[PDB]
Design a protein around this ligand. Structure first.
Ligand SMILES: OC[C@H]1O[C@@H](O[C@H]2[C@H](O)[C@@H](O)[C@H](O[C@H]3[C@H](O)CNO[C@@H]3CO)O[C@@H]2CO)[C@H](O)[C@@H](O)[C@@H]1O
Length: 300
């Protein structure tokens, strides 16, 4: 129903809109790294998220390093499984080239181009697909103008040769926080969005103001990852600040995916130890974070 109704997504005046020009807000879950917790990514779990949580997007977090795709490329087949499930379930799907320790997206740019060529050839005639070409550029030696923008200007044409207008999300500096510099030096492609990531354990008032600055430059922003925890993915749960961010995102038409769908014993994990990887989770099988995130999506 979601993808049939909204169909082709595009950016109009800095906003994500559907094929009839109406604003639409995606809300869903990210996997954790597919090399570690890939068992939680399957049609049945995604169907349960759709039906019981109300998700309308799923993010497949394919780490490049840390035992991910560069080390063992088999994890690309799990991305394909996720995409196929999203197509069958009629929800959107984010294909996330999940850089992190490999902090400059240029490190594995040749592999990224290859990977996005393959994915856009396979899936470029479905409206479900959103390409996230570099999760979290980071480090003081990685800037928008010097590193990230020219990386994007190599990868985007590879995608566009196969898929001329599905959404592309481009990471920003400082772990996808530096939307200000991106917004001042935007990419040409009209269906690009810039990633912004937050963690509720950080006091967020200035970060909200910087998102507003970026929006005011006509840049579109997708909150392609956020957590209820501290910035490490752990360190307690911060539901008061999370709620402030939830309300902010609703007021600004900002789509989002929460980190993450795993049973790992860290505060950002949505599931308890013993949660079934194919779904069906009782209240007792959701973590503090998962209970909250589920409520936010069901409210929506
Ligand atoms: O258990 C698997 C490995 O986990 C590694 O820690 C990861 C955290 O569990 C995870 O929450 C964190 O997520 C990041 C995400 O990649 C980018 N956005 O920010 C999130 C919060 O920091 O990523 C951690 C690093 O991959 C751990 O380091 C390994 O030892 C484990 O094998």
């Amino acid at each position: 129903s979601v993808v049939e109704e909204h169909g082709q997504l595009s950016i109009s005046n800095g906003e994500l809109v559907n094929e009839r020009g109406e604003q639409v807000q995606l809300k869903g879950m990210s996997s954790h790294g597919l090399q570690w917790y890939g068992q939680f990514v399957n049609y049945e779990s995604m169907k349960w998220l759709r039906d019981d949580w109300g998700i309308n997007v799923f993010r497949a977090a394919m780490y490049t390093s840390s035992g991910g795709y560069i080390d063992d490329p088999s994890v690309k087949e799990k991305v394909k499984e996720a995409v196929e499930a999203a197509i069958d379930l009629d929800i959107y799907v984010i294909i996330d080239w999940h850089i992190l320790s490999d902090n400059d997206p240029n490190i594995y740019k040749e592999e990224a181009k290859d990977f996005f060529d393959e994915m856009s050839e396979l899936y470029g005639d479905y409206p479900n697909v959103i390409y996230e070409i570099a999760n979290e550029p980071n480090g003081s030696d990685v800037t928008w103008g010097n590193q990230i923008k020219p990386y994007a200007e190599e990868v985007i044409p590879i995608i566009r040769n196969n898929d001329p207008n599905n959404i592309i999300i481009v990471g920003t500096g400082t772990w996808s926080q530096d939307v200000h510099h991106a917004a001042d030096n935007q990419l040409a492609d009209p269906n690009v969005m810039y990633a912004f990531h937050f963690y509720a354990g950080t006091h967020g008032q200035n970060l909200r103001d910087q998102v507003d600055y970026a929006l005011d430059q006509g840049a579109a922003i997708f909150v392609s990852e956020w957590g209820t925890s501290a910035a490490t993915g752990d360190g307690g749960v911060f539901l008061d600040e999370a709620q402030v961010w939830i309300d902010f995102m609703d007021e600004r038409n900002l789509s989002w995916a929460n980190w993450s769908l795993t049973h790992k014993d860290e505060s950002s994990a949505a599931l308890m130890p013993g949660a079934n990887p194919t779904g069906g989770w009782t209240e007792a099988e959701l973590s503090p974070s998962g209970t909250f995130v589920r409520e936010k999506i069901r409210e929506s």
